[PDB]
Design an enzyme around this catalytic site. Structure first.
Site, mmCIF file in Angstrom:
data_model
loop_
_atom_site.group_PDB
_atom_site.id
_atom_site.type_symbol
_atom_site.label_atom_id
_atom_site.label_comp_id
_atom_site.label_asym_id
_atom_site.label_seq_id
_atom_site.Cartn_x
_atom_site.Cartn_y
_atom_site.Cartn_z
ATOM 1 N N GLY A 28 0.793 -1.233 0.000
ATOM 2 C CA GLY A 28 0.000 0.000 0.000
ATOM 3 C C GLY A 28 0.819 1.273 0.000
ATOM 4 O O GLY A 28 2.004 1.312 0.325
ATOM 5 N N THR A 43 8.350 3.593 -1.606
ATOM 6 C CA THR A 43 8.234 2.160 -1.846
ATOM 7 C C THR A 43 9.166 1.380 -0.920
ATOM 8 O O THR A 43 10.299 1.821 -0.673
ATOM 9 C CB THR A 43 8.625 1.818 -3.299
ATOM 10 N N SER A 72 7.556 3.937 -6.786
ATOM 11 C CA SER A 72 7.364 3.431 -8.134
ATOM 12 C C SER A 72 5.951 3.553 -8.673
ATOM 13 O O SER A 72 5.801 3.481 -9.900
ATOM 14 C CB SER A 72 7.883 1.992 -8.239
ATOM 15 N N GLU A 73 4.935 3.750 -7.833
ATOM 16 C CA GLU A 73 3.577 3.933 -8.322
ATOM 17 C C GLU A 73 3.090 5.371 -8.221
ATOM 18 O O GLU A 73 1.884 5.639 -8.327
ATOM 19 C CB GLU A 73 2.636 3.020 -7.509
#
Ligand SMILES: [Zn+2]
Ligand SMILES: [Zn+2]
Ligand SMILES: [Zn+2]
Ligand SMILES: [Zn+2]
Lengths: 206, 206, 206, 206
Positions: A28, A43, A72-73
């Site tokens: 998450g 991350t 990374s997201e």
């Protein structure tokens, strides 16, 4: 509404997300709208070792703050903020029921009146694209045009709302709806749904 | 049996209901019979932020106490008190197994001898009507004529009993029965049941 | 090995049984062999309000100690002690997976090598009879002749062992086996099993 | 990197493994690479009673340290260390979803992009052999040649990684993947998977 207070709130949301069983390990990530960009968790740092110094500021241009870990997201959080001006906080997780529905590549239909909390009569499922890509960002932006939450095929969930508390609350309600859907799908397919007329009444009431 | 003591007990029931996994977020609400009406929790305040001052008194005429938050599902609590004179406490929640059975629109049959705790050989499922309506109130009143608990189609559960502890205890037993039913329905439909003769024996013993 | 120490151990077993998710509300009861009878928990007292004074001594003749609450399922605990001389502690509960298998009226077959912990290649399911009856006692006595645990059709589980810790440990292993069985039964029926030859090897090793 | 510090870390991993719901009772065991052998937990001591003195050193020749309890599954931990030079910690448990997939004797296919965490596009299932045998050791060694985790048919899971934290993290991710697989298998068989092309992209990114 200073940075340190928001950082604290992001960390508390991470802890609560884990206590509710929605977040396991490092899957998450949470963000809030801030100045011209957002504050987000990095991350790979488990929730229990997260400190205020770990929170990363990413500006409107996508420039990451000096000396911080990567996220990374991050691109689909920025896509949510650009697609939904009203969103001030975004919660992403790989909660098990939401994720199982995303593997089936199904939207969650109006099996319960609380489906209206996400804005309509369904929870959409956006098509798969590799995490961190522009392609995934575009699918998320389109899914959130008229909904406050969306499943991500073979991946998990994104939920957005006006503050961190409401965003987490919504993420949990979508996980409950996903569990209701999978539990009933195992017995009967398709599952009975409320009519569009009935959801329209509920939407007005909310 | 003063107001502040009952308010404390309502808050403790809310906390225990969450600890047992029956209540998530702001879906549940609890009430007790008091003077000519009831004391009930308000809509939208998470259990952990609830204080004694939040508890609302709604009289027999449906007048809400001055300066309190609304409780959008108050009408079916009042319908329970009018339908069952013996009920002194009412628990409502959207517990996942109870709610999944309510989506299938099925009663829970006598799959276990503890079904007799709700008064008979089944847990009924009352037909759907919008929350907060007179129509929903009438369906609840009819379902509770001969049962102490009922499912609400596409919605959740209502359980009533002589005090808060027994009402919560009953709500939990119905969630266990619903989980037993869904787990076995996935393997065989229909599920084996005890005969009416056998439930009659259990009812006498209880 | 005095009464007060054993009473403490019974209460701690009740608490641990609840923490492991095997006991909810007032369904479970625990006993230990003592003098010519047993010490057992009474019916209807929730685990958290249990004190040493609540524990009841029931002698070999079935006479209950003066001034204590009843235990409506005491007869099948005494049947276990008479059927299995080696049993010194008995755990009863209505754990959800064990109970769901008991509704299907199936034994649990050798789906995992840990099935040998109960003495053989299966966990039997004893036929239904009303709680508290001599008839139910006889079915339990026969099921425990060659097994240390048995399911009770439409009811729950009984597990016995040389002390309270091992009895609880066994009860938990049977709940794990029941969950494995139901989860796999939903996908394929029948479920693959280990051969009797393989269970014989495991039994020797244990 | 002294013995007492590693022993502490092994005990903390055991506690966390239980808190995450992956280990129940005495089924799990953990080891770390140390000198010419490994440090491992003994069989039969519940996590809560484990002390530093309980941890056993087993050398490269398989000689057990004087005065310690046995560890009946030690052979497949040593097989993991010999098969994967890069492994420094091994986690074994009988987590329920992993174990249910192992009863079906299926590998977990690429239903989610996080399958790449174990090194490829699947989680293999090694064939059954009695615990503690050379035969079981050989099946484990072959399954871990190109994967960091493997299911054990009719038994459970083995996961290995560069340190204890990453090994536990991986074990938990495999339990999540197993739960996703069983939940979706109950609805549709076979379950949709990501292509090998897509997993190749994810593997590079990781
Ligand atoms: Zn993700
Ligand atoms: Zn409601
Ligand atoms: Zn019972
Ligand atoms: Zn094992």
């Amino acid at each position: 509404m200073e940075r340190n207070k928001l950082a604290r709130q992001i960390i508390d949301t991470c802890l609560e997300m884990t206590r509710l069983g929605l977040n396991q390990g490092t899957a998450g990530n949470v963000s809030v709208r801030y100045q011209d960009g957002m504050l987000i968790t990095p991350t790979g740092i488990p929730y229990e070792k997260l400190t205020e110094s770990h929170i990363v500021f990413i500006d409107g241009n996508g420039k990451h703050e000096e000396g911080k870990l990567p996220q990374s997201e991050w691109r689909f959080h920025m896509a949510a903020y650009q697609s939904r001006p009203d969103a001030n906080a975004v919660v992403h997780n790989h909660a098990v029921h939401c994720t199982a529905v995303s593997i089936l590549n199904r939207s969650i239909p109006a099996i319960h009146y609380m489906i209206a909390a996400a804005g309509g009569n369904s929870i959409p499922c956006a098509p798969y694209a590799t995490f961190g890509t522009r392609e995934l960002s575009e699918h998320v932006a389109l899914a959130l045009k008229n909904r406050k939450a969306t499943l991500l095929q073979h991946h998990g969930l994104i939920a957005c709302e006006v503050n961190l508390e409401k965003a987490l609350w919504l993420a949990h309600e979508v996980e409950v709806l996903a569990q209701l859907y999978l539990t009933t799908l195992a017995i009967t397919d398709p599952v009975p749904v409320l009519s569009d007329e009935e959801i329209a009444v509920v939407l007005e009431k909310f």
